Amino acid sequence: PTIEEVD
Amino acid sequence: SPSAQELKEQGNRLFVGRKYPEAAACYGRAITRNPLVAVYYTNRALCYLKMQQHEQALADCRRALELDGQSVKAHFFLGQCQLEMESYDEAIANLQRAYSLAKEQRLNFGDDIPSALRIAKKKRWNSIE
């Protein structure tokens, strides 16, 4: 649950 | 010979390890195998932001958005990028769009996006002064 992260 | 998803995960693991140029290269190799996957571009765009390469980050956001117009991260990374480039109004609208899209998609990032929005609006305001 973190926006600034790769998928 | 690694697969596209193998290279993406290797890129991911390098990113977590703060090896941004190495990770960006891995995503490049993923793209070579399958250029039609939005996440490869949004992942690399985040590398470019960490590497201070805003123009490249911008270009990757556009590649992702053309593949997936609903991408929350593509809009969020684009707004962050614009924020650092001092395109304040564009930055805020893209962060707002990321917020709306995530809400629509029932994606939970807690208060991350509203937090980034406050930061962006604070910066535009302070800049105006």
Author numbering:
A (entry chain B): 640 to 646
B (entry chain A): 23 to 151
Q: Anything the authors wrote about it?
A:
The Carboxyl terminus of the HSC70 interacting protein (CHIP) is an E3 ligase that blocks the ATPase activity of HSP(C)70 and tags substrates with ubiquitin for degradation. CHIP has three functional domains: a tetratricopeptide (TPR) domain for binding to chaperones, a coiled-coil domain, and a U-box domain where ubiquitin binds before transfer to a substrate. The opposing co-chaperone to CHIP is HSP organizing protein (HOP), which also contains multiple TPR domains and increases HSP(C)70’s ATP hydrolysis, enhancing substrate refolding. Both co-chaperones interact via the EEVD motif in the C-terminal tail of HSP(C)70, making this domain a significant mechanism in chaperone function and a therapeutic target. To understand the structural interactions of HSP70 and CHIP at the atomic level, we completed structural studies of the CHIP-TPR domain of CHIP (21–154) with either the phosphorylated or unmodified tail of HSP70.
Although the new structures of CHIP-TPR with HSP70 peptide and pT-HSP70 peptide are globally similar and nearly identical, key differences are observed for T636 and neighboring HSP70 peptide residues. First, the position of the HSP70 tail near T636 is different across the structures, indicating the potential flexibility of this region, the potential for this region to adopt more than one conformation, or the presence of crystal contacts forcing one conformation or the other in various crystal packing arrangements. Second, the position of the T636 side chain in the CHIP-TPR HSP70 peptide complex is not available to pThr636 in the CHIP-TPR pT-HSP70 peptide complex because this would place the phosphate group of pT636 in close proximity to D134 of the CHIP-TPR. If this mutation is made in CHIP with non-phosphorylated HSP70, there is no contact between N132 and HSP70, so modeling predicts that G132N should not affect non-phosphorylated HSP70. Due to the position of the N132 side chain, removing the pT636 phosphate group would not result in any steric clashes; therefore, the EEVD tail structure could return to that seen in the CHIP-TPR/HSP70-SBD or CHIP-TPR/HSP70 peptide structures.
